[PDB]
Assembly symmetry: C5
Homo-oligomer: 96 residues x 5
C-alpha cells in the first residue's frame, strides 16, 4: 500500500451504478520522507478520512476486497488512517 | 481511479470479437492540479463522455466490472464524468 | 489499452508449455502525439499485426481474456489494429 | 518481486476490519546494485522482518496468496528475508 | 512480457511456505535496443535460465499461470529463453 495525504473530494453524478454509494477521495501520494509525489489516486473511502489526514491506499484488485466492494470498478481504496510512521531516525509522522 | 480528459476516439476494425460494440476513447491523464500528464489510456466508455470532458478512469481488472464487460479484454474503463473536484484552496474544477 | 507500433518478432524455443502456439510481438509504446516511448511490451498477437502497424495493447490480466488464453502467462496482448486516431485538431493517424 | 530494505513500521488504528491482525512495514525499494530507490511499499509482513533487513516484496494480487490473506486489501506483501544476492562480479549482498 | 537478462540468483531461507521450491532469479530489464534498464524483477524460474541469458518475464498475475504456481506469491515469472529478437534493421539479438 501507499502512504498518501487527503487533498479533496471528487463529485461525479453521471457514473456507473456500481459506483453509487462510494465516497470518492482524491489522495496524493507521499514518499518515504513524507514528501508529496505527483502520483495520486481518486480512491473510494471505507474508513472516513478527512482533509490533510495521512492515509493508507490499497491499489489494484486489493481495493475491491471489502464487504460490499467486490463488483465495483474500484482501482484504489483508502483502507486506513495513519497514526504514526516510525523509522530508524525516529518518528517520521505522528498525527498528534 | 484517475482524473483524465477526453482527447478523441480510436477506431479499430480488425479486432477481437470481445471488443465489438465497445466505444474506445483516448483519455489523457490529469495530475492533482488538473494538468495534463504524458500517461494515457485507450479506454472503453460505459458512461457516454465527449471531447474535452473530465472523466474518471478505472484501471486493470476494475475496468471489467460492468454488466457485460467481464470477458472483454479491457484494461481501462471510463466509469464517470466529473462535475467537480474540490480541494482545500477551493474548487479545482467545475464543469459549469 | 495503449497505442503501440510493431517493431518486430520475438522467437523463444525454450519456454513454458502454455506459451506454445502464441505469436510474440515486440510492440513499442506510443504517446498521445503518436511519438515513440521507451516503454514497450513483448505481447502475444491474436489479431495478425505486422511491422510498423499501429496497434492496441491490453495489459495485465486483460491480456488473458480471449478464447483460449486464460491459462497462459500473458501480460500483454495485441487486441486490435488501429485504423484512425482522431483528436480535436483532427486526425492524429490514418492507416491510409 | 522487489529487493527492499525495512525502514520501519506503520501504525493505523482507524482501518478496515480486513487489515486487523496484519503487521504493516514500510519497505524502501532497492535497485540491482543494492541502492535505495524512491519507490516504496507499506506491506503486510508474513515472515517477521526487522529494521534494515533486506527483503522480498510481492506486489499486486500476489500479496494476497498467503493462507489467510485472500480477502484482505493488500497490495504488497513481504514474502521473504534475503540471505544473499549473487551476481557475475560475485556476492552483491550477504546478510552475514 | 519484458526482455530481460539474468544477473544472478536470490537465496532466501526465511520465507513463506508457498515460495518453497521456487528458484529465484534476479533479472534486469532490457529496452527495445537491447540495452539494460534500471527496472528489474526477482522472478521465479520455470524454464531453467542461466547467467547472462536473455529471457521473457511475465508480470503480475500472469506470473501465477503455470501448473503449480496458482497459490504462490509470485509477481514475476521467467516464462521463456529468447533465441532471437528481429527488428526492421535486422536481428537485434541472436543467442
Amino acid at each position: 500500500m501507499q502512504l498518501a495525504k487527503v487533498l479533496g473530494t471528487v463529485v461525479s453524478t453521471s457514473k456507473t451504478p456500481n459506483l453509487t454509494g462510494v465516497k470518492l477521495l482524491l489522495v496524493q501520494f507521499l514518499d518515504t520522507k513524507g514528501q508529496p509525489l505527483e502520483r495520486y489516486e481518486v480512491a473510494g473511502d471505507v474508513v472516513g478520512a478527512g482533509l490533510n489526514e495521512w492515509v493508507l491506499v490499497a491499489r489494484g484488485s486489493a481495493a475491491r476486497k471489502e464487504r460490499g466492494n467486490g463488483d465495483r470498478p474500484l482501482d484504489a481504496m483508502v483502507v486506513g488512517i495513519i497514526d504514526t510512521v516510525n523509522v530508524a531516525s525516529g518518528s517520521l509522522y505522528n498525527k498528534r
